[PDB]
DNA sequence: GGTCTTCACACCGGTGGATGCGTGG
DNA sequence: CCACGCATCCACCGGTGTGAAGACCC
């Protein structure tokens, strides 16, 4: 459950608990006595509650409390089980909190995408959570798909192979000189649903929670669209970077600087809307150092990062995503 | 001293100690009970010993132990003074160790540059540490200057005003659209000594240690060259990034990707020899993801394409860094006429 | 206008998991 | 002579030290 409950933790299986005791089975070059299991805590805390689509006390709750509830639940569970012995270095809580932010925001915008698709097909506009109805003409061809890209994806395998051959041969020509184009995969891709996927019912049902089958469904959602996305159908790219610093904001920038290079200067796409989400952009000047330029081609100059967002609540992210979808989907024809 | 000594630590003044007790004077948004004094630690440990130019036991010692000795000295000092109460979070030891790595390597290469300048001017080749004499023709115009760039420098102020006007105009044109070219300053810049400084005796004396006056001298070495180097006279840039990861290594790459953009695509310089130094490149593939491209110039081919990072280095010992710097200077100074 | 306090810059180290590989029927 | 399992890599963030700049009471 969202709030910690002793009975539900007791009823959990040994291999399904938030904290795994690996004192007797150490990792090779680490001293992690107790290991947080981010999948298990995600399925435990956000099992029946998804932020922005749950009771009105969770949608309006500060996002820094929703993203950080699973770590509190894990710490309480570990204290309950291994009392006077539980200890996790903050360098594990940081990684786990970042991954939880990534997955929770991806789930929230996946629910938003499912609601948008349901509206576009013609199944009405669900009003259980009070959200404004978009002022766009419904159309099955305007539907959207939210992909949570994996840890070490290629991000080009999504492209249609008639437009992937040029990118592959560009990389091959670069490889002849012992060079490359390395990049980190953007943490989420919002694309236009392909033509043959607009009758599927899996893109129109909101997930009840982030259970393990739902985690598998969300994580593996990119496989179904592998090789079915046109270069211009990549509507948005999102980098989830919680609490940026003055040197860690240059990884997303590169993540965009290469991205446009492979979509603007070599594929003819109009623009790439790469944007960064963060929770605590303090101790940094990210609001003014994210106005960086790009490869500029030769006119063709623009911001590398479209915007930086700091979601106040969990519902504000959903509202902003709905507004952005309403603003952009009008460009496509359906 | 290098090895911890109780008497010398006791003789230190309260404001000159490695660890500062700021429990009663907390920082604004932090809970740092004890603050490591990076400058005081550097002046205490490396106060009379510079790695690579000291006794043969320190030159050959593993670099991961030389870079990490001051933190051990501070921990021992704090345990000695605030017993049963000293504790500093590893997120402070990491920052301190990185800064110590940067400053110590900068001092080592500064000593190498001083020896090279002494050889070029005509004072022979000092042979107290056994280093190979470069096989290059001595000339006062081949002298090199090592600058330890500050935390929030610009690195464009170093260029001559004639060659800075084009960069400033490009930045102003970008600024007209609400844009910019932000970048992190490379941690060190090796440049060719300006002709008007080629007789100063300051760039030819090896520092005996990293004392506070010598720390100030090394840190403020860039001020004297503010607007006196040529676009083609920036010999090399060095990013000291200790123990890279699979996501932090993209910060130096950008630091180079912008750099060439302002030296090759807007100044006509032949090439920029940006390179990265690290101690523990484990848990990553930095040896392969540092073959990245650049602004790529023309469409394709071998016209204006090259590695953004020239090479990744992992110094085994403290003397190996000096040997590599000497070899690089000898190999690449024949390009400059003299 | 001179101490004093505050904020941004660049620092790294300890991790969880998906995935390609090591060895044995 | 293909497997079940262990090993390596990818991307995560949070706690800091110091220098330059704002405060401000003159
Ligand atoms: Mg991220
Ligand atoms: Mg560095």
Residue numbers in the entry:
A (entry chain B): 2 to 299, 304 to 339
B (entry chain A): 2 to 339
Quote the study that presented this structure, word for word.
The SgrAI filament is a left-handed helix with approximately 4 DBD per turn. SgrAI is a divalent cation-dependent DNA endonuclease, and analogous to many DNA nucleases, likely uses the two divalent cations in a two-metal-ion cleavage mechanism.
The first structure, resolved to 3.3 Å, contains the active site mutation K242A, which inhibits DNA cleavage and leaves an intact phosphodiester bond at the cleavage site (hereafter known as the scissile phosphate [SP]). To make the SgrAIK242A/40-1/Mg2+ filamentous assembly, we incubated K242A SgrAI with a 40 bp DNA containing the primary sequence CACCGGTG (termed 40-1 DNA) in buffer containing MgCl2 and incubated for 30 min at room temperature prior to cryo-EM grid preparation. We observed filaments on cryo-EM grids and collected a dataset containing 3488 cryo-EM movies of the sample. We were able to model 2 Mg2+ ions in the active site, in sites A and B, and the absence of the K242 side chain is evident. Interestingly, the absence of the K242 side chain results in a shift in the position of the SP toward the space left by the missing side chain, consistent with a role of the side chain in positioning the SP.
